[model samples]
Target chain A: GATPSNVVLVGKKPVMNYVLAALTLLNQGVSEITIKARGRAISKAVDTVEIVRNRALDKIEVKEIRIGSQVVTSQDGRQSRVSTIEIGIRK
Target chain B: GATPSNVVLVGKKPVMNYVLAALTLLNQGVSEITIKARGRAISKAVDTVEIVRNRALDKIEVKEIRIGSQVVTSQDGRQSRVSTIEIGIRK
Candidate 1:
């Protein structure tokens, strides 16, 4: 990555876990916070940003959401393309 | 507005206009840049983002895209819901 991101990846963990991670970076004055997810986790990542933007810092605002793909290994270790999104936010 | 945005609103102006607006902001080192449009201008905004992010700075990245609506006054002074999209980009 050309930019070293302060990012949290979406997973089976509760949605707020990623939200908190982003919030931690934002409140600490990091200029930008990025939340990313693959496949079905995409919507959850959106929800996380929505809730955080609504309830967290007064300056909470989103920059952009990018839709693309990342190749990842499945359980059998075969590489496959997974739908992905990267949500960027800042305070 | 909680944030005073560095924003460009897409209109009948050629796509390059908004693209340059965003590029100007990124070049100025603003933490974020927002491009927005209502109704038909929405796609123009997307195209602007695609061009800027792909062709401009290496550090440019999107944070979140907020899809929503804004009430606007028409020529006859009637309020209407125009589909709105805000594309937020950053470096």
Candidate 2:
């Protein structure tokens, strides 16, 4: 199971930015956090996790990964599909 | 651990192409297979796994997800880092 409080939604920001978000949660004594993204940001999410485990932190590990798709309605009233990912991590 | 024999590498091909590759491997009696991609193809990798588990097959599950980076030297001899993902699935 994952908690909602400690979640970092990755976006167009640099990978180091997301890494700092996760580190901040961990420093607040939150042992677990989930990194999530949609579409192209998925790679940024993975990069954020890798940097956390490899460079920014110690004893942190990946817990689980959940993937699916979400339907979105664009401004022009057309529907499209976007892939989503939730990566759980724990210390 | 992941096996080298039953692996599909995602690229510029469509998501269904990679899904068919995974399904073909499973139909060949390989109960486990991995879908790997780096950089921009990462979302396609996730899409492939989601389709395989949701629409293409029954009783198949995601077993593990491994993420990291690889260093590539371009033709100009400039070093670059690419994010990578290995999504393991089992039947």
**lDDT per model, in order?**
0.71, 0.86
Q: What share of the true interface contacts does each candidate keep?
A: 0.10, 0.62
The window of 10 residues in a row where model 1 chain A has the poorest summed lDDT is: A38-47
Q: Per-residue alpha-carbon lDDT of model 1 for A1-91, expressed as tens digits?
A: 5544588798778877887887777666676888887655655666677767766747677787676656788899898655566778777
Instruction: Write the residue-wise lDDT of candidate 2 on A18-53 in tens digits.
Output: 999999888888998999999889878988887788
Q: Which pairs clash in model 1?
A: A63-B88, A64-B63, A64-B64, A65-B64, A65-B65, A88-B63
lDDT of 2 by residue, B8-56 (tens): 9999998899988988888778888989999889988998887787655
Which DockQ-derived CAPRI band holds candidate 2?
medium
TM-score of chain A considered alone, across all candidate predictions = 0.80, 0.89
Per-residue lDDT, model 2, residue A37, is: 100
Q: In model 1, which regions exceed 4 Å deviation?
A: A1-91, B1-5, B74-77
Error in Å for residue B56 of model 2: 1.8
